[PDB]
Paper text:
Here structural analysis of hydroxyketoacid aldolase from Sphingomonas wittichii RW1 (SwHKA) revealed a dynamic movement of the metal cofactor between two coordination spheres without protein scaffold rearrangements. Holo‐SwHKA forms a trimer of homodimers, in which each monomer adopts an (α/β)8 triosephosphate isomerase (TIM) barrel fold. In total, holo‐SwHKA contains six equivalent active sites; each of which is formed from amino acids from two different domain‐swapped dimers. The transition from M2+ R to M2+ A,S is induced by bidentate substrate binding and occurs without a concomitant rearrangement of the protein scaffold.
To investigate a potential structural role for the metal cofactor in the M2+ R configuration through interactions with residue S116′, two different variants were designed at this position. Notably, mutagenesis at position S116 reduced the expression yield of soluble protein by more than 10‐fold down to ≈3 mg L−1 of expression medium. Identical orientations of the alanine/serine residues were observed, and the protein fold was unaffected by the mutation (rmsd=0.115 Å between 230 Cα atoms). Surprisingly, no significant difference was observed between the wild‐type and S116 A variants of SwHKA upon holoenzyme formation with MgCl2, as the thermal stability of all variants increased by ≈7 °C. This suggests that the thermal unfolding of SwHKA is not initiated by the dissociation of the trimer of the domain‐swapped dimers. For the S116A mutant, a lower apparent K d (i.e. higher affinity) toward M2+ A,S was observed with Mg2+, while the affinity remained mostly unaffected when Mn2+ was used. These data suggest that elimination of M2+ R could remove the competition between the two binding modes, and thereby increase its affinity toward the M2+ A,S configuration.
Residue numbers in the entry:
A (entry chain A), B (entry chain B), C (entry chain A), D (entry chain B), E (entry chain A), F (entry chain B): 1 to 251
The structure:
């Protein structure tokens, strides 16, 4: 079973890890914490395909669903990640219904999409009866990061093969001419985020959001977000190190 | 100049980072914080020589001294790390004066040691005037983590080519038949640590210590330790993630 | 000389290896067996560009032509593989004449295509007179894996710069609403495969096919297929290991 | 639980995989077959520490015990592999009781050995209750592949911290001035192998053996060997490929 | 400050290194020579994303601007390189105003482009006030390598978000039906190169050029080219080795 | 055949490449030049075992003998390099007859040495008739770079399983209390080098030498040295780049 789809099917949200550092050790350790999934960022990180492959194995062993935020919404890139046992896909900068159809096409075998058949690691997980439940094993979220995406939210949500949307708040803030701050209080950005959540739920589709703090994630969970990521390993490591230095130097 | 030797020459201690995760991004980010050095652990980590090499470049760029805790006190292993721009060496499990001489021999060119000549990255850092100050550019600490090392402390300190010692408290606790707790305060281990510190200062040599928390490091700095490491990137990242999950799932 | 083009020019087919495992050791060992080429799969494998590069060197040394089944029909991806000494290109999911023109454009220098000039490893193989015979050194096959590709077979074969087609039977079976089994007996799939072979030969172009067994490859060779791949290293290794376990446990 | 120690505690032998190819995909696939352990060869392979680390994760996920045949009986090499989640250690060329004590010392924490404390991946597997069962979680076998080792068999078996011995027949044949044939049945080598097995069982210690075929492994299991490895991934892949080519090129 | 933009703002050209070999050692050594930038070639090289990442760190430490000649003009590929601290982008085979707009869009944050926000290594270099000067920190050159690009030079130069053009002479020679020789004397190619330079300067935009020799670079600098690359590490290493062999064998 | 042993058996010396940069491209290109061997330096370089493995494949394909200067004279390190197709071994810092016996033991199968059997890549090169000529296929040189080694030269040369010695002049200069200059001509060092050469030839054993220039190599070849290395790839690349910059920035 997909542990994020299990959470949803039991009427409960998913809390996810977010990794911008390559390596299997921190991936496994965070996966063993009370996270339902761990997302590997391949957009804003030095993580190439060579480095994601063993991190997906580490997350699965830790007992969380391996998710990937891809570099770009490219069909063949996403297919190769699925065949390496990425059981969740978050595609950045999905601005139109066609781009959302491009995402959906890659996540599903024919007749439902055009996904190429060679499921190396999924066939090892789910066995010979993988084809019949292949779509159920994978989670697909289109990212809302632009005024265009926000304007096209209704038509993006109408695409069948995506489970719903994942808001990128910093990029959404920036495109609306505001500060690209994580967990922004900016009234227009908060209003847009709330609007995207309501339309998603109105369409019978899931809504997720990127968070930079535990306190902000708690509010988003209380607001009824289905998928909540908190926080980037680098940001948490940087903050903890600064705090350790402060305590050590009596600052 | 060696920023740890600069700290010492201005009669003040060095605060160091400690890395068990491979990769250049967190190495650079931590190096840019108020650390004087960053130690890469090659004993209790998945970091091979292939992975340490670019991490040393990242630490130097961040503006901290690249240090390495080696797998073992092996002359040729240490020489290859120096030639890749490791400007500090912490050798584990140094139990005798001969093992401490084995360490010293690797850190210095002839006549002072038997270090092989090919300083690829040090010649790029220090230029044509590297040979004249080569010993000054490198810091060498023998690890005390056994009853044998503790018994042989005076003869270890008498070796000319080491700057002094680096206590491993958890391993020292374990060898004395106590619980290997991070920041252990078992009276026998505290007594041994205090003894090692006083003999080091009595011998006109530096003393350092591994810490798993900022609070413990502050005490060790206040106790007059010259080199204090706090804390492992993995431990800080794991603790921060647990705290972020706790805050997110809180009522 | 291109050993697959040598086979064809002597009126004889090519038997090829198929690799989904990264590493140079098995690549060399299989290359030294009675294979004319060895295909590296970059679609349904964990093999990134970093890992293909030395595998191409290993195959060439073993005395087989390095072939690559790419992730996708992308011009620049294919050009970079040619410049790393991939002397055969199999492009997946080529469904139209335009996509087949996209393939051809990447395999040929101007005026014949738009291939960028910097032939790092081919210039080392073929020397200063490489430009004059550059097209002859490379083999290009468009993959037929869809009802669209099957319907457009005539217009795909009419493209000048491709040597012909390579059938992907599992994907072709799946898109026709049948089981994605290697070496399928499904009458409609067998009929389509036979149809694609006849049109290819009628057009004076080569036809190849993916096989999962030696027995099936023998039939395809007897059917007059020019390029026959048998079998995936993973599938052969998995089957052999199961058989070794069975013999060991007296099953 | 250690699945090899589970086999032994239920009075029955362990069948193990043997890997000379680097990569996580074949490691996982073989681990999912009816093997109790999978040994990664770091002596007679291109597998460095960088490449073994993620292979140990893949084997554990597949549901077999990660074992390692090390390059050499080096304490610090073995400790670093344990801390990366190698739960079995086969040390080559153990010829004396002192070399066997050198092995034992590395596999156990103080008081029983001198193993350095930092169990990164074992603490993630076994949790907070790891230290209490740490020795139980690890399996240690000294390799017998010399006339010296064969002569010193009784004194090697008398060492407390090793579970027993692992025979290398080809190297044992070669050192006795015979042909280094896989699954050798040279009467002198068979006599020595039989002698080593009886002395091991007489000493209340385990005996294992390297096999290059399923048929030979079945005999060794029937001869009462506790740990049987069959066969090297490369050898099985090479043999299968030769057979597939033979069937394809047959009349 | 961007050291190439510093050169330009002081009314002076930039001399750049050009690297087709992966690794950090030669990158640092060349960066410490009298080069203003060092370009890493990702088109005509075995250098994947995994291998560029630490080379960018090495170049920055050496005290030259990290530049990248990308595989292709792909928005998301370029964004990921910027976020890994590539502070110059040379995009190959830019033939139209739209392709040049595609380049510009990737180099600038909203409203000026559509660059995704997550500046991992640039935020570490330039700090919290990076957003305000983000565009000034990056240099963007569209490559002129085709008759199409040459014909569209005016419309390419009119695009706001590119600093100007970088001529690829070998590809330009080849597309004009001449020999693909570095530093060609071919009158038509020299005429076209001179024409492209004049139109660039007439448009108030920068012009750069690839050179295979120091003598040719001196002429291009004297001709008023703003960005001059000389020469490929492989070509310089190959020539030097041939000369060393000649001197050694008395040839 | 071993191309260095072929040179010697035809009563003539061997010219060798020397590589401190990792990667397969420059290794192949230099191997295709008029070098008999190419030595990979694993002592004074960032090249780990992971990176040497594919470089040995590249050198063999180029048509030169893959040699390795190891980190240290360690039996098991040398055996693993032989099994990865290193057909020449230069062991640093061999100071005694016992250390030279330690080298010899690793290069030969029983009865002649104690080399462990698993010749992965040599069995692929030389086929089924490898064992009969295994010692003939490998070249072994003990390095003389200390006053101890120089004093023990006669007893080092008396060891049967080494082909002879390889002088490290810079390290020999340094140990004798002189400047470690490339191609040093300090009278004491020249005297020692001359002494080592005459004793080697008197003992019916080969003598080799490290050179940093083609001119110096020509003299050493004229002095009757059997194996001459010239020059390090880094040194040649750095010198060529400096010269290209000088010519470019010239008036
Ligand atoms: Mg975003
Ligand atoms: Mg297919
Ligand atoms: Mg070009």
């Amino acid at each position: 079973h997909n542990k994020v789809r299990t959470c949803w099917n039991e009427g409960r949200p998913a809390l996810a890890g977010w990794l911008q550092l390559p390596g299997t050790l921190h991936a496994e350790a965070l996966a063993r914490l009370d996270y339902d999934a761990v997302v590997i960022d391949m957009q804003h990180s030095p993580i190439d395909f060579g480095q994601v492959a063993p991190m997906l194995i580490a997350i699965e062993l830790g007992g969380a669903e391996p998710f990937v935020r891809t570099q770009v919404n490219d069909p063949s890139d996403i297919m190769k990640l699925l065949d390496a046992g990425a059981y969740g896909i978050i595609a950045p900068m999905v601005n139109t219904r066609a781009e959302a159809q491009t995402l959906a096409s890659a996540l599903h075998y024919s007749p439902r999409g055009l996904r190429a058949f060679g499921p190396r690691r999924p066939s090892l997980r789910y066995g010979s009866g993988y084809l019949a439940q292949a779509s159920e094993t994978v989670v697909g979220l289109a990212m809302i990061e632009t005024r265009e995406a926000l304007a096209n939210i209704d038509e993006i949500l109408s695409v069948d093969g995506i489970d719903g949307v994942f808001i990128g708040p910093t990029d959404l803030a920036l495109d609306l001419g505001h500060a690209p701050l994580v967990d922004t209080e900016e009234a227009e950005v908060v209003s847009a985020i709330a609007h995207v959540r309501e339309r998603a739920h109105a369409a019978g589709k899931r809504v997720g959001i990127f968070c930079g703090s535990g306190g902000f994630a708690r509010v988003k969970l209380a607001e009824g977000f289905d998928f909540v990521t908190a926080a980037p390993d680098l940001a948490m490591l940087s903050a903890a190190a600064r705090q350790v230095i402060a305590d050590a130097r009596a600052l």
